[PDB]
């Protein structure tokens, strides 16, 4: 609700935790620490 949005803005808090584990993602081969391999993301986090 917008009230919670304003409360978060006033208190100065971020809403970034990690990745979702419900939508059946592989989550595992998504980042081979070499950037240029196929199927390798770069974000170890986000807001979902």
């Amino acid at each position: 609700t917008p009230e919670e949005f304003w409360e978060l803005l006033s208190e100065g808090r971020d809403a970034v935790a990690g990745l979702p584990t419900d939508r059946g993602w592989d989550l595992d081969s998504l980042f081979h620490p070499d950037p240029t391999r196929s199927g390798t993301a770069h974000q170890r986090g986000g807001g979902f």
Binding site: G18, D28, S29, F31, H32, D34
Partner: protein, 473 residues
Amino acid sequence: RSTEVDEVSALRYRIEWRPTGAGEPARLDGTWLVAKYAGTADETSTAAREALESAGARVRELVVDARCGRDELAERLRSVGEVAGVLSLLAVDEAEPEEAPLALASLADTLSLVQAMVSAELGCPLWTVTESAVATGPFERVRNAAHGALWGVGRVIALENPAVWGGLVDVPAGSVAELARHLAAVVSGGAGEDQLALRADGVYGRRWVRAAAPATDDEWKPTGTVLVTGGTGGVGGQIARWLARRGAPHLLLVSRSGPDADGAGELVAELEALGARTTVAACDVTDRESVRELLGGIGDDVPLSAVFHAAATLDDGTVDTLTGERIERASRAKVLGARNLHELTRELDLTAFVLFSSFASAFGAPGLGGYAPGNAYLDGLAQQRRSDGLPATAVAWGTWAGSGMAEGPVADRFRRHGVIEMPPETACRALQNALDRAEVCPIVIDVRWDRFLLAYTAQRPTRLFDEIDDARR
């Protein structure tokens, strides 16, 4: 485009976390206890006492000396009264011990408390709290690996005395306000969840999933030598023939004493007939100087990749008083060997630590309690090594048809229900697929769930095997 991977895809499983709800936290009644150590000095204890007193509970504080004893703690416990909850805050501010990776006071001290408490037959469900040792995903820094050992034995404890050992939590270090959010819900939870993975958002109870195999057109070449723990004794032996089928030029599988007791003339001659210029570690891996000399004694020639953690040593430990020192003595080969390889291979060129382990680490094994801490330490090491190169690996390799210490009473006990023996060539094929994909949790085992659920349930309910379609019916 393929139809013969069935058996390879049959023995493919994985561990992961899934967000769940909560029970019905109404009111805790009793004389709840807390005991970290003699040091105490933790504001988390104050927050826990505040929450427990808010939830109608009498809070009492106890102090314990590092390896204080085995029975005096029971003597003071029996003089207090009846309790139904203990907060073991002893895992705070002690991330990883010194040079000895298993000489942690928390582990052995907790075993002493549980032994004294069953001796006193008090009946309270133990509730332990650890720091960040379990990762909700591969995108996290596992702060240390020793704490995971607490989990490895812990599940087995749940089988030994189901009336106690309520469960564990995660509660990442710093910003302890999470322990002031629910706390009472977790301990006083009617859902019976025990593998709690508390984090910044809700709860993340542990679950077991199938590992579907998306086969890809890639290739891993074992050029030169390969790192596999165990050398030629047992598990390594057949493994040594696998690369013989592959045709690797060299090998340096690490063994306890090499030609002294491993390999022998028949295997040596057969391997040299198949593939020449192959070696096995003749020196003990526990000594750092021995590993340095072995690495300096090589002819350089060829690097490798895909570090492996199959198995190194088998040293009993079914059920006993279970002191902490004997576990370290048993694991002193394998854990310090892995530590030495990790220390000495950082500056070389490889990919990552593609771990293997025994199947006893996955879930609670009543007869292999002492085997779990080494596998848990290996898992923590692999998760830490993920930081550079290639992702981690959590293989939980089972039992061989032709070898393995767990072939007597162990295989007799779980061969009548669930698990059976497994051929070696299937293991080679599954391992080739695993290295082709390089997953982080390739549990490799075959089990018959129809009797396995009945055997595992017995008297303790569990919400673990709820993601297997066959387990539902």
